Amino acid sequence: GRASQYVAPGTVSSMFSPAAYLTELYREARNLHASDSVYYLDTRRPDLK
Amino acid sequence: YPVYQYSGNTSGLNQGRLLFHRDTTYPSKVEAWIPGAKRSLTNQNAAI
């Protein structure tokens, strides 16, 4: 039902929300380092995921 | 916005169709109650 559900001009459920931004950033950023690297994002901040 | 389509007249239909347009975006059903006939048609899980 996505195309029937429009959201408020600033809400967490919105594609233009910072949550959406965070989602995109994490989805891409998380692969910047190898999973076994000390600098791996998830290792550094597991609470993030 | 209802229109009744008759069977025949070049388009044979099995008993005819009550055509309608609806504005709602909700995935509901549409009841068409006909009080004098004490009949009602329902389009269950009707399209938007």
Got the DSSP string for A27-42? Answer: HHHTTSS-TTSTT-HH
| Dist CA A22 CA A42 (whole Å) | 14
- Displacement of CA A33 from its chain's centroid (Å): 17
Q: What count of residues does chain B have?
A: 48
Please, what sign has the CA dihedral across residues B34, B38, B41, B42? positive
Nearest CA in chain B to A2: B25
Smallest CA–CA distance from A5 into chain B, residue? B25
Provide the phi-psi class of A14: left if phi over 0, else alpha when psi is between -120 and 50, else beta: beta
> How far apart (Å, rounded) are the C-alpha atoms in residues B1 and B12?
23
Residue pair B16/B6 in contact by the 8 Å Cβ criterion: yes
Q: Does B27 touch chain A (CB under 8 A)?
A: yes
Residue B9 three-state SS: coil
Shortest Cα distance from B43 to chain A (angstroms)? 19
C-alpha to C-alpha distance for A24 and A17, rounded to whole angstroms: 11
Name the residue type at position B36. G
Largest CA distance in chain B: 34
